[PDB]
Design an enzyme around this catalytic site. Structure first.
Site, short mmCIF file in Angstrom:
data_model
loop_
_atom_site.label_atom_id
_atom_site.label_comp_id
_atom_site.label_asym_id
_atom_site.label_seq_id
_atom_site.Cartn_x
_atom_site.Cartn_y
_atom_site.Cartn_z
N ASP A 264 0.83 -1.19 0.00
CA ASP A 264 0.00 0.00 0.00
C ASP A 264 0.88 1.26 0.00
OD1 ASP A 264 -2.10 1.92 0.40
OD2 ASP A 264 -1.92 1.64 2.63
N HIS B 192 7.52 4.12 6.16
CA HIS B 192 7.84 3.88 4.76
C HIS B 192 8.95 4.80 4.31
CE1 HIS B 192 4.19 1.59 3.36
NE2 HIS B 192 5.09 1.19 2.47
N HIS C 191 7.43 -2.10 4.00
CA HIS C 191 7.32 -3.55 4.12
C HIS C 191 8.36 -4.14 3.20
CE1 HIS C 191 3.59 -3.18 6.23
NE2 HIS C 191 2.97 -2.58 5.23
N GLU D 115 4.86 -8.78 -0.66
CA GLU D 115 3.46 -8.49 -0.37
C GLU D 115 2.61 -8.78 -1.55
OE1 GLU D 115 2.11 -5.09 1.49
OE2 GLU D 115 -0.08 -5.34 1.14
N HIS E 245 -0.80 -8.82 -1.37
CA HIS E 245 -2.12 -8.44 -0.91
C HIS E 245 -3.24 -8.60 -1.93
CE1 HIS E 245 -4.01 -5.54 2.06
NE2 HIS E 245 -4.86 -6.52 1.72
N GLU F 22 0.97 -9.03 4.45
CA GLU F 22 -0.27 -9.34 3.83
C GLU F 22 -0.17 -10.14 2.54
OE1 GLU F 22 -2.37 -5.79 4.76
OE2 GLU F 22 -1.20 -4.55 3.30
N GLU G 4 0.47 -3.38 13.47
CA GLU G 4 -0.12 -2.12 13.11
C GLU G 4 -1.30 -1.94 13.97
OE1 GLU G 4 -1.12 -1.95 8.95
OE2 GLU G 4 0.64 -3.30 8.52
N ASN H 28 -7.23 4.22 -8.28
CA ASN H 28 -6.52 4.72 -7.11
C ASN H 28 -7.32 4.78 -5.83
OD1 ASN H 28 -7.57 7.54 -8.05
ND2 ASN H 28 -6.99 7.66 -5.86
N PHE I 283 -6.25 7.46 1.13
CA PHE I 283 -5.71 6.29 1.80
C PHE I 283 -4.19 6.23 1.98
CE2 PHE I 283 -10.10 5.11 1.96
CZ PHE I 283 -10.19 4.71 3.30
N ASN J 110 -1.77 8.56 6.31
CA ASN J 110 -2.07 7.99 7.62
C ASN J 110 -0.97 8.26 8.60
OD1 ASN J 110 -3.83 6.45 5.77
ND2 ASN J 110 -2.00 5.13 5.56
#
Lengths: 1021, 1021
Positions: B199, B355, B389, B414, B416, B459, B535, B595, B599, B602
């Site tokens: 993400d 990140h 990640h 990942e 996901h 994930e 998390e 997109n 999101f 954060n």
């Protein structure tokens, strides 16, 4: 163009462990793509599956680079017509190399030699237009060694490594209707070779089948079966997970049906779509069915109950897209509380390691051979086999499934020749390559019931790569245990302690990786796993001594659940002589370098599947019924876990020194793990002197699938009584005359005459009438033509000072010289008495001393009495007896003692005491690497021609002197000598066999007393 | 030729997970090849290590296939001059995509899109002739995203995957003296992309450094460090294992020396050759030394004690071949008895996920940024960070090692976006690819002390591939625990229960993968592992409500050892407007499709590293000192495990409604895990009414490496007493006049006048003198411009009916219409009394009812008294209060209540009660995605201009109406309105934050009472 050799070969994919394949399809269980459910059910043949086995064109090259671009487009003038599958070394192109540990090529991973024997195979064939309308047409090679590139209709298709598993490619888009052509280029060496260093001949080629499979577009991509049980196995669940490929359409369904014969037992139908697995959902392309089965018939090696499972992929309107199937066996395998259980009871593995070897075909397997092997094994009391050391030809599992053998399936990974052993297996860079050798095996063989244990490979030390792979398996298929011996036999990568060559009672504490005595290993602090030997009892040549010790521990300690003998067949190959005469060849016999000679011959059976005598010792020790005699009651114990003695008769019998006095027959009614009592009728008992022996045999009255009627499955014998002879012979009518001279002493009586040479002290000759009997004097013998075990790994170059032979050699045993100390004749009232004494010495050391007396009497019988003294400080002698060369040559041999087969002291439990009569030819054991053989122990009387010897001794008799044996590398080079060579031993040392590279003879079997005494009676009829 | 694009590209290695690299060297710890031991010791720079960072030539193409063979030989006319490292999306070539879960490209593993953005980089450079005499010259790319091919001097070198780890190639034989040229072709999408679905923005290029390293021919190939301790850590052993490459010559030696500063602490010397490992021996090319260290200084995040380790490879005559080094930290990490221990004590992880993100540079990291981040974190009470990640830029570990942060290193894996999540991770065919993402990480980062836990990725569900990889690690490096959350957070692949977004007290029992309440999760039957959240507390926009609940469990339950907040920085990017004005952009703002909009924001800090208010709430909850007040004694508890309060002063202070009456300062002498008692002086106590508050602060008098002097590390406040006001106001001199009319009621008194509109029932206007004060009537407010949490994942397309906003929307809250039920004026003895009542309704449903009384008195003060009734069956309102638009605009705001920062009800523990004075500008929180913000709770008095309001309320004040906020997608588009908008709440619902995709507001914070009452006093100065 980019299809060009030039381009392709450029990348040198065979010198890179990071490329194990290119464009290869995924692994899976065996498919046939039946298009009719019944055929599937009955295992009929699928028209959708075509064999490309046969005549192919082949051309050999010394390096991939020497291949001509032309090849891609057209055959080659000089290409020969070869049959496929085959091993090109089997055809003459290059030599097969017999090396054990030491890699064939130079160790420079991941590089391979520039001179790298390339074999170009090609095949022209027809594809039916129908196959190209739809579906997928793919190709399969069940085994290509070691690596290869593939082209079709001049186009490059893909590449593959791993000699022992199938590579599949989709040819769908390269194929043209009608005439197609394949060009397959097989490299002998690749980076894959570093992982294929098994102790066996190093060969190459397309050695397993080639096929074509046509599948629907929407098809079954994989499926697995699983069976759960309830506490008592009265109920099971069959669980099938199916996955498909193609377009998923709601009208799609799956039906899984379970048949037992003709009788459908259960069926289930459903449409695609699994349960929720995680946050994103489930597999829409999978479905799992669960069938309930009440009171399922269980599969075991004792009774291979099988069901048939049919998997149909159809639409909802009932239309069949395609079907697959497999045999199903209901069984549970678990390690629980230190024990390995099968269907709730604890196994006792009577197993053997078996390689895929054919003396003629090299490493190409066929159904006939497989079957032969299986039946021999079952006949001989084996339960299980280990696939040393790679996945086998597919059919194998199926047969085992069907005939009933437990199988340990093993990954094709052996890096024995690295230093240290770990070197690659501990390297993350080899993780992928290794990974594929394990995963694909599992995906392919997982549905077979016969497979009960997975093995990570062999002799590759212990690396982090193993740990990962072991965990992988456990995750994927928890139905079976995993085992791996590398790195000490008890690492974290094995569920079972599975050493090789661990002794029963003695420890071998090598640094880092000791081999404790098996009984001790189990109780080491913290240890709780079961112990099953992956290899034990090295059956190389005249071997198997001590086999019984093992059987006994196995029987006394629960956690000792048996082992795998090493090994099944001799890896000898056939060669032809100057007159098209065949002969058994071994290491280095193909000008192969470097090589391990006889080391490739450790089987229980010869390459032709004819048994070595050891085989019996096994058969008997591994027998499923056990006896005890108490008074006149026989107690029978069954070692079967699942079946009842229902094809078993017990024959019993009593005999006095070979003479039968009584017989019975009694049907066995013993349940698995049960006892049966048998009371014998009042047994006769004679006044006559001699030994009374009871002998019992279990017979299979009816034939089975692996045994004939009247097969003997077990036996045991006991000595019941002895009536000692208190009778003095009838006072000689005559009296022997002694004629002296300075050269010798002569004894005459009747037509008979005996001469003893006064200079040597030996009986130089004897006559019956005008005929001489000896060709060689009767003399003391303390040596033997070295068995494989006596030699070990000692070479002329590199001497192993510990090897028995070396010790003996070094001490002068073989070249000691006699010395007359005394030689006298005396006249007795009714006989002549000769008395001698020699000393054997070497470099002023007296090794032994022999003292005899010969006493000839009016009966014309000589009684020899011998008494040896052995120096405390000399290696114990292999034997102690006499030998001589007889002049006669008779057709038969008859004796009263152990037999009928070759038997040694630490290898005679399978033999029976009785009167045997056989052809001379049968008194010689044709071990390909000649050595002392043919002995028979506990002999009381032996008869050859007019001679008869009596006493207590061991003996052997053939047309080959010890020296000839000792000096001939192969049996085919032996030549029969003038008469008959006779060796009569008062004593013989054991043969050993715990291993063949260190002294393995247990102390109890070594001639270490110092003082030895024995007596004989030679005479005529 | 075979170097041709045409040839190379042909194989399509980027569409094949079976080829992850071609010709790439092995991984290892960071090397520099110093040729002088001191430089090595002091970390000076190695002349043998050269950076190729800078100006490179670049050209972009829409597909690899559109590259021109020319490129290989010569630059391109149109090639631009770009700086490297960089992300080409950062330069304009293509757009960055901000997608979360849903893969950027179409899901067809292992295929990638034909349109695949290729970036051609090139560099011309000089190689010094010396480098070519000997040694090896290799190249390194610390990060190329996503895959790439490499040529040197027109020759093809190799290929590589894995965006987050280094790829190294030996250029030794392609290099020519002087002028060399590199051609690097970077593919945006590859089969590696399937494993990189994190993400975050999807970018590409050579985004980490490029270097050249020159090593000797005989060199150090790898080395690892390890430290064992004794029961009390009074003694350690440093163990170093070294391996070398090249020719092994007996004169070779290795010396490992340990320095502490200038002081050598220990040294060891030896020659190559390890201990026996297995049947074949040992590693001749390895050596292991062991140094004993007495009373080692231990490393921890509290005190980063470091040593320097120097590894010299020399000959015996003392000549240095080469040297390597690393920092060493003595620490032990273990899970024992359910607890995670560091150096024997149990950690409490105060961590955050971070990140690698730069608003300007995209994903290119620099030292300055790293350092900033670190210091902010340390300043704010963080101990640890998770590399969400993927492996980070190398320097990161080093800084952490040095400044002191615990690091969880995570594999770049990942998936996901697969369905199910497992799909690839359960597939043996991905095993290899995955394998390399784990193994290389470990080989590279294993020697850093800051790394205390390894993580398998994120994930990607739970597959057999994880199990294997987890076992691998455990085998290879047992010094650290492994964690992985996929598949339920407590699988067999994790040593720690590490869920994401598990609530404290409530369970979220999704099928297959529920998320139990953390307190409950621990006591599930059979469970014994520690629990640390990977998390938690989703910090998206106006968030962090409930943060304290977590802190409290952590503190009460031992096995709850903290967690990682999600996340550090906002992943917003900088864009420029019509006038070269920058603004913060987000998902879809680059025409990016598909997109995830906001999101990507954060963080606790904005992309520029300026804090969001949440940051304080964290800082305070995570503080290392804890207080309790008992009488006039303060009990201090230290949460430090290793250090003593030695740069800490406690400031204390007492104040009555903002007025200071007393202060102290007291030096803390508390040991780790200790208590300190503090007795306060006799505290003054006044007659005056008001609240007496005690406030304490811990100060760091001296500067540290990450804090300035006078940094405040903790605080706490208590209310001590209250003297209630029993004083009635001075009987008004004057009396207000009420002038009626049919339109309204007017109240006059002095210069002051108030008008209430009789048709609406609201106070429509008010004057002070000739000046009007309102622009908008004072009216009831029950809604709020939705925070990110109120919205969740609800979109216009796909509505989430559960999202608070949706509920509110659906129920008419936002569009309810008032209804005058009553409006009366009455004359009191000394005041005027207005009385009203409205009903808010929507579709004939009365949602709420508001009942007020305004009472104006001779003092010219209005007292508003309000009483709301909320329908049981309507979603609880976000708030309940009034608002109006003031005409004035003042520079400051002053209030007596909680602050100084934005504080909400479930997010106000870090705030203090006092008198605050700030600029209007500071009363607005510039959350990039505008929403309700700036609230301050527990206000007792607020002052703006001539106004003063008094009572108990929460309020907010800015130049933006709720509606404007609610209707602007970005903050840069907001425009200040006519005057000042004031919202005064009697009540406000909490903000939530447990997660941002489902309702997270705890019940205690929801306005669910039905009956609400409040009062105000408005007046002037």
């Amino acid at each position: 163009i980019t299809d060009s050799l030039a381009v392709v070969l450029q990348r040198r994919d065979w010198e890179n462990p990071g490329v194990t394949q290119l464009n290869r399809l995924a692994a899976h269980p065996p498919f046939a793509s039946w298009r009719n459910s019944e055929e599937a059910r009955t295992d009929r043949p699928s028209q959708q599956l075509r064999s490309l086995n046969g005549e192919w064109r082949f051309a050999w090259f010394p390096a991939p680079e020497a291949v001509p671009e032309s090849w891609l487009e057209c055959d080659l003038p000089e290409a020969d017509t070869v049959v496929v599958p085959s091993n090109w070394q089997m055809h003459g192109y290059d030599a097969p190399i017999y090396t054990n540990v030491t890699y064939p090529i130079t160790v420079n991973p991941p590089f391979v030699p520039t001179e790298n024997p390339t074999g170009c195979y090609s095949l022209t064939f027809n594809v039916d237009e129908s196959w190209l309308q739809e579906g997928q047409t793919r190709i399969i090679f069940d085994g290509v060694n070691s690596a290869f590139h593939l082209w079709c209709n001049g186009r490059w298709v893909g590449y593959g490594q791993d000699s022992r598993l199938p590579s599949e490619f989709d040819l769908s888009a390269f194929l043209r209707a009608g005439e197609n052509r394949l060009a397959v280029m097989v490299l002998r060496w690749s980076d894959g070779s570093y992982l294929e260093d098994q102790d066996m001949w190093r060969m190459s080629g397309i050695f397993r089948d080639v096929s074509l499979l046509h599948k629907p577009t929407t098809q079954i991509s994989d499926f697995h079966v699983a069976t759960r049980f309830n506490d008592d196995f009265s109920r099971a669940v069959l669980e099938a997970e199916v996955q498909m490929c193609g377009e998923l359409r709601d009208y799609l369904r799956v039906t899984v049906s379970l048949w037992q014969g003709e009788t459908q037992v259960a069926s289930g139908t459903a449409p695609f779509g699994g349960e929720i697995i995680d946050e994103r959902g489930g597999y829409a392309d999978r479905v799992t069915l669960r069938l309930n089965v009440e009171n399922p018939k269980l599969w075991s090696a004792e009774i291979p109950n099988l069901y048939r499972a049919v998997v149909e992929l159809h639409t909802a309107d009932g239309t069949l897209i395609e079907a697959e199937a497999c045999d199903v066996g209901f069984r549970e395998v678990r390690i629980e509380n230190g024990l390995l259980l099968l269907n709730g009871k604890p196994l006792l593995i009577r197993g053997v390691n078996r390689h895929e070897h054919h003396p003629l075909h090299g490493q190409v397997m066929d159904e006939q051979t497989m079957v032969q092997d299986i039946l021999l094994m079952k006949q001989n009391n084996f339960n299980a086999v280990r696939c040393s050391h790679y996945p086998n030809h597919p059919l194998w599992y199926t047969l085992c499934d069907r005939y009933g053998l437990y199988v340990v399936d093993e990954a094709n990974i052996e890096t024995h020749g690295m230093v240290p052993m770990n070197r690659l297996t501990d390297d993350p860079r080899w993780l992928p390559a290794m990974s594929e050798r394990v995963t694909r095996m599992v995906q392919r063989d997982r549905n077979h019931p016969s497979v009960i244990i997975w093995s990570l490979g062999n002799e590759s030390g212990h690396g982090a790569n193993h740990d990962a792979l072991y965990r992988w398996i456990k995750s994927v298929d928890p139905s079976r245990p995993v085992q791996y011996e590398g790195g000490g036999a008890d690492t974290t990568a094995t569920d079972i302690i599975c050493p090789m060559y661990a002794r029963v009672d003695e420890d071998q504490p090598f640094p880092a990786v000791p081999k404790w005595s098996i009984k001790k290993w189990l109780s080491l602090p913290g240890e709780t796993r079961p112990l099953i030997l992956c290899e034990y009892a090295h059956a190389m040549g005249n071997s198997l001594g001590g086999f019984a010790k093992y059987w006994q521990a196995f029987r006394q300690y629960p956690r000792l659940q048996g082992g795998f003998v090493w090994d099944w067949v001799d890896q000898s190959l056939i060669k032809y002589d100057e007159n098209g005469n065949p002969w058994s060849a071994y290491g280095g016999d193909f000008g192969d370098t470097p090589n391990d000679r006889q080391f490739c011959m450790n089987g229980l059976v010869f390459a032709d599947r004819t048994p070595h005598p050891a085989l019996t010792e096994a058969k008997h020790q591994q027998q499923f019924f056990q006896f005890r005699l108490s008074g006149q009651t026989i107690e029978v114990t069954s070692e079967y876990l699942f079946r009842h003695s229902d094809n078993e008769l017990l024959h019993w019998m009593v005999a006095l020194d070979g003479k039968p006095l009584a017989s019975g027959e009694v049907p066995l009614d013993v349940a698995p793990q049960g006892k049966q009592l048998i009371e014998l009728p009042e047994l006769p008992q004679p006044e006559s002197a001699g030994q009374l022996w009871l002998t019992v045999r279990v017979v299979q009255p009816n034939a089975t699938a692996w045994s004939e009627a009247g097969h003997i499955s077990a036996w045991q014998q006991w000595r019941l009584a002895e009536n000692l002879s208190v009778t003095l012979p009838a006072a000689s009518h005559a009296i022997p005359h002694l004629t002296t001279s300075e050269m010798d002493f002569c004894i005459e009586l009747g037509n008979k005459r005996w001469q003893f040479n006064r200079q040597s002290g030996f009986l130089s000759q004897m006559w019956i009438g005008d005929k001489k009997q000896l060709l060689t004097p009767l003399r003391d013998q303390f040596t033997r033509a070295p068995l494989d075990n006596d030699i070990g790994v000692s070479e002329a170059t590199r001497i192993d000072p510990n090897a028995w032979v070396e010790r003996w050699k070094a001490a002068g045993h073989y070249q000691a010289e006699a010395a007359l100390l005394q030689c006298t004749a005396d006249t007795l009232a009714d006989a002549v008495l000769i008395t001698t004494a020699h000393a054997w010495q070497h470099q002023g050391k007296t090794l032994f001393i022999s003292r005899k007396t010969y006493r000839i009497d009016g009966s014309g019988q000589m009684a020899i009495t011998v008494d040896v003294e052995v120096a405390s400080d000399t290696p114990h002698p292999a034997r102690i007896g006499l030998n001589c060369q007889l002049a006669q040559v008779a057709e038969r041999v008859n004796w009263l003692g152990l037999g009928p087969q070759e038997n040694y002291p630490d290898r005679l439990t399978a033999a029976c005491f009785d009167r045997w009569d056989l052809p001379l030819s049968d008194m010689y054991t044709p071990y390909v690497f000649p050595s002392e053989n043919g002995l028979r122990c506990g002999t009381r009387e032996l008869n050859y021609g007019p001679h008869q010897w009596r006493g207590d001794f061991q003996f052997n008799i053939s047309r080959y002197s010890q020296q000839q044996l000792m000096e001939t590398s192969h049996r085919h080079l032996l030549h029969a000598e003038e008469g008959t060579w006779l060796n009569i031993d008062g004593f013989h040392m054991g043969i050993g066999g715990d291993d063949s590279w260190s002294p393995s003879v247990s102390a109890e079997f070594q001639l270490s007393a110092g003082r030895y005494h024995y007596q004989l009676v030679w005479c005529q009829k």
